[PDB]
Design a protein around this nucleic acid. Structure first.
Lengths: 75, 43, 136, 116, 50, 177
RNA sequence: UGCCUGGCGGCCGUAGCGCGGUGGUCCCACCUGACCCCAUGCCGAACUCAGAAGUGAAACGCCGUAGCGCCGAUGGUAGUGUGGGGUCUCCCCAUGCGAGAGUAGGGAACUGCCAGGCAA
RNA sequence: UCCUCCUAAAGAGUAACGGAGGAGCACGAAGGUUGGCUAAUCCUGGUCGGACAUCAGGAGGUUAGUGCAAUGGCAUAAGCCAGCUUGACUGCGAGCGUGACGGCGCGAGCAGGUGCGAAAGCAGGUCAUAGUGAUCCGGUGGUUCUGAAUGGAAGGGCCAUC
RNA sequence: CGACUUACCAACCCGAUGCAAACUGCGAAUACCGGAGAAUGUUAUCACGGGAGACACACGGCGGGUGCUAACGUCCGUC
């Protein structure tokens, strides 16, 4: 009675650390918030992370819970 | 202390049979008559 | 007939038996039977070997079983075409890698221990050897 | 714990101001000596501070830790900030209800030039 | 799908309307939301209707 | 309030001498009292909750609040968020007068009295007890009520253990039979 | 410049827990009252206002202690890219990368800005 | 047909009559904002009350909860309570993700007019991921856009919707 | 109403030993994305236009599902 499946949602990181992006570009597609928005990064209703400014994207770990953050520096 | 939601807490004097009289604020009403108290009792 | 209770899933993938054994040392008794070959032992084989030693030692000492099946195996019924879903679970097997200690034992002389293990190994499908508890 | 509850209360506001990147006026209140501070967006340096703990401001008001004290400190931060140059700031409750002394300090500050 | 669709008609003379859904079994009374009417470019009261 | 002055007059000294503490605040002191009434039969007739709350307002000096079930359990046929009891917590000054009424007019009027228990301690310094009937308190006339349900009392203090809590209560001439 | 104290950060368990000691000149906390401001799905509990008597008990800060958590080598082992070999449902050789766990050990923090008291 | 996990070989994708489960909704609030709050499970004392109702204290730190299966996420809570509300708004939309295509998804910002807050600010539905059906034909309301000699009308077009 | 023993059943925990595609307090090698640089390659790259064919694949190595770790079996990934 098996045989059912769902179409893959093509999640994952779209832009990796150290590459320039344009404002509004999608950086990470995720179900929850595995990565939290940092500086110049906005979070969508579906927890999508997009660039709010033009620059280089970088990843880092911050906070007491060592949770991962994505930031953008104007470079 | 909320208003017009609590019962009246007026003072009232109560005395028991063994001659002990004390003033207490409560909701007993108008008058009270007692026979025993903390003392004068076979506790 | 060792078997788990209320396992999470009825069926599981075949997998592979690559790798190397972890429980390679005697931990409970003073003597043990180490696995030299690679393969899988069914629940029936484990029971048969256990009965052989208990009779050999005449219920003297202690017996430790260091392997549990915890892996269902299916088998299609005779005269059944391929497909139409996974087969029904039939028996449970334990994957054995070289160096795995199968049974442990204590409370008997070394001489009597050797024959007891030899009888058990005669009813197993994998090459085995006799080992003794090491000091550290 | 009073402190733990207060920090938990103000964490969301502090994070919101931090990511917004704007100078924030932070006020700390106690049974005596209400404090006030101005913090740069990075959060690493203090532009200017005032309070009733120093004799320069504690030599006039009868008692420190009342509405009058809050107005004095709220006013005191004003001309200091105006003299420094910074005009716009973001008020931070720091977990203190914006009702009494905190409100009085903010009201004195906003009417004294630090509109927010 | 017991929930059924309704029409919200602006209180102004304009014919603009919104469309939504509601459950008549639980909340049988009318709906009086205050929404934006672009024909008059003002926020007005919208009444439920068919 | 009278006993509060009595407590502040020499009881603190009595606590001071017996435990010879370093400071004055080290002595245990009561901070609040709590009244509980786990009626339980709200399901059979929820209408009785209001009057069950009413009498607690007679004993207490304020309006009770109705407590709701923490969770639903099939063994009691109770769903989450369903009121199944009421409680009252009183502190400040009003607790003192109620403490008078309990220690002077209530305990003596216990039907088939035998003595207040002394082993009713939670292990940290808090005292709890229960009563059979309401008529112990003077605020019941025996004709306006027709129920046998009781209530529970609990007094909590700043004691770090039972020994000082028992000693502090003994200073309040508790029976402790 | 130093012992301290409060606030805002950096950094985030070598930074966190447990046990013992230590602090009231200021600051901090507890604490008195609350008619008024404010609040309790009841309570000055919590929040808020008017105060400073008393206190360092609790909490908080600092010191000591490894009793835990935590960090952690070197070596070896497992795995593995590429090219070969075997008694090929698994392994070995040459070369490159190289864990996890464990062991020796480390460890009971460091640091920037502002404000206040004492000694300087 | 759609959703979640595994198979799937640490980017994405990836088959089988392979192994497990769900959906064809719900909600004018379960939405927006402001303010406040922080579980499960155990130990001790206490009337009915009893292992399991409610009260008090202690260990615990999220094993709780999150309208619905699963995965990911959630203390700044996305979890729980209350006040005021309709941003579940209109016209757009830089720039991206995803598809052979039809299409689907995210979105700063601008104009108009609103709600909450002292304010910075948040709000273009709901913690996210299922709750859905192209085109044709026809119905309803608005709009002189058109309206085959002219003025109208019928019928079409455009917009909203069935 | 105090209270006690046990040749006997046993929860939760502690010490040691294992197992897991649908467990992860850890975590590679490769692969993939982006940037800089030299050499090399008949622009090997991308965009647009004209014309196609093909959409029955097979075996071998490696990682797997299925089958009996059977099949010159069957179904995927990569060469």
């Amino acid at each position: 009675r098996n045989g059912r499946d769902s179409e893959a949602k093509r999640l994952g990181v779209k832009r990796f650390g150290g590459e320039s992006v344009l404002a509004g570009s999608i950086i990470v597609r995720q179900r929850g918030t595995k990565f939290h928005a940092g500086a110049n990064v906005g979070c969508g209703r579906d927890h999508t992370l997009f660039a709010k400014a033009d620059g280089k994207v970088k990843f880092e770990v911050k906070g007491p819970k060592n949770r991962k953050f994505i930031s953008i520096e104007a470079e | 202390m909320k208003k017009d939601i609590h019962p009246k807490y007026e003072e009232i004097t109560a005395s028991c049979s063994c001659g002990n009289v004390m003033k207490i604020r409560s909701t007993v009403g108008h008058d009270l008559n007692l026979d025993v108290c903390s003392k004068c009792h076979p506790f | 007939m060792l078997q788990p209770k209320r396992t999470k899933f009825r069926k599981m993938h075949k997998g592979r038996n690559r790798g190397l054994a972890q429980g390679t040392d005697v931990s409970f008794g003073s003597f043990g039977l180490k696995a030299v070959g690679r393969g899988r032992l069914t629940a029936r084989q484990i029971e048969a070997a256990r009965r052989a030693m208990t009779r050999a030692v005449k219920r003297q000492g202690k017996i430790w079983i260091r392997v549990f099946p915890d892996k269902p195996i299916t088998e299609k019924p005779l005269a059944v075409r391929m497909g139409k879903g996974k087969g029904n679970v039939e028996y449970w097997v334990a994957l054995i890698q070289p160096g795995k200690v199968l049974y442990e034992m204590d409370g008997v002389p070394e001489e009597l221990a050797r024959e007891a293990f030899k009888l058990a190994a005669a009813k197993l499908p994998i090459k085995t050897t006799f080992v003794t508890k090491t000091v550290m | 714990d009073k402190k733990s509850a207060r920090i938990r209360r103000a964490t969301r506001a502090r994070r919101k101001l931090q990511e917004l990147g704007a100078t924030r006026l932070v006020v700390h209140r106690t049974p005596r000596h209400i404090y006030a501070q101005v913090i740069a967006p990075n959060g690493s340096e203090v532009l200017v501070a005032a309070s009733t703990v120093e004799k320069a401001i504690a030599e006039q008001l009868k008692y420190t830790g009342n509405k009058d004290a809050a107005a004095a400190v709220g006013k005191a931060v004003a001309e200091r900030a105006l003299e420094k140059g910074i005009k716009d700031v973001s008020f931070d409750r720091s977990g203190f209800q914006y009702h009494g002394r905190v409100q009085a300090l903010a009201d004195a500050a906003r009417e004294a030039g630090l509109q927010f | 799908g017991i929930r059924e669709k309704i029409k919200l008609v602006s209180s102004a003379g304009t014919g603009h309307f919104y469309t939504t859904t509601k459950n008549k079994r639980t909340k049988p009374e009318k709906l009086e939301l205050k929404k934006f009417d672009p024909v008059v470019r003002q926020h007005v009261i919208y009444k439920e209707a068919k | 309030a009278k006993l509060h002055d009595y407590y502040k007059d020499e009881v603190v000294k009595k606590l001071m001498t017996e435990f010879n503490y370093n400071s004055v605040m080290q002595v245990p002191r009561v901070e609040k009292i709590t009244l509980n009434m786990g009626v339980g039969e709200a399901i059979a007739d929820k209408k009785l909750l209001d009057n069950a709350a009413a009498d607690l307002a007679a004993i207490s000096g304020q309006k009770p609040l109705i407590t709701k079930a923490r969770k639903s359990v099939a063994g009691f046929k109770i769903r989450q968020g369903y009121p199944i009891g009421c409680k009252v917590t009183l502190r400040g000054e009003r607790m003192w007068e109620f403490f008078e009424r309990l220690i002077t007019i209530a305990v003596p009027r216990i039907r088939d009295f035998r003595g207040l228990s002394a082993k009713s301690f939670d292990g940290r310094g808090n005292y709890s007890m229960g009563v059979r009937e309401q008529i112990i308190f003077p605020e019941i006339d025996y004709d306006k009520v027709d129920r046998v349900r009781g209530l529970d009392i609990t007094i909590t203090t700043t004691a770090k253990s039972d020994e000082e809590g028992r000693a502090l209560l003994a200073a309040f001439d508790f029976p402790f039979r």
